[PDB]
Design a protein around this ligand. Sequence first.
Ligand SMILES: [Ca+2]
Length: 275
Amino acid sequence: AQSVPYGVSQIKAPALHSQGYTGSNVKVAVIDSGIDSSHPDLKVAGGASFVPSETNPFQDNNSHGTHVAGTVAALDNSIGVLGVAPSASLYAVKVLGADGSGQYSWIINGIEWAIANNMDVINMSLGGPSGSAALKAAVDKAVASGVVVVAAAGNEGTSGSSSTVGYPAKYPSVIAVGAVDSSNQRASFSSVGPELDVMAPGVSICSTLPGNKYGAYSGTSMASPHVAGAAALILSKHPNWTNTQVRSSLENTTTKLGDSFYYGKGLINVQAAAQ
Ligand SMILES: [Ca+2]
């Protein structure tokens, strides 16, 4: 039978699924280590691989990409888990390899592909301690072109009085997502900083793994897809919304939790955000 992970319920997504808003016709890109399409609980529309050593984007040799994909769009049916946007057209943009590592040229090319193939939402459950003029530009270009770009704040914890949010999450154009547990307490690994925007569930997140499996992972990497899915649910109710309206709606309707340096605007509530 099907189990709804606590996270999907915490951001109040099932309220919209019941209104008939499941994210149908919204295209979301999982810029990651590819997505295993043979999972009975996932429906991958297309994608591309920018990893030179790994040509099949529908092959995830790591486990990370599939997991992230399931939190966004695991199918609403009688098996496994449920995503935030179960009817979303999932796109596997493989920019990371089997060891989970990827080069910025690969990531940047993955973001570029997402723009020309008109993705409504881009999800980047990845990041680094350094930027690039090409990375800044790739993500800014996506936003200028109406794409909602979501990214994990990073898993660097606190650092005195400084920001530990990595890139591309550190950029003003990118929605940097941190992690909260079930009780709404910031996960100690979640990056902090003035660049944090919202928080989404990220501790012990149950989702899809390669080869008809389900397993839990903890990270801001698992936080990100709840906000990516949430942006897709909002878009299915209001298809006329610009990426800017999806964003301000998501940040202005949050549940305030603590100081913005550690919580951003707070926990996203997609029910209040969709309006
Ligand atoms: Ca399912």
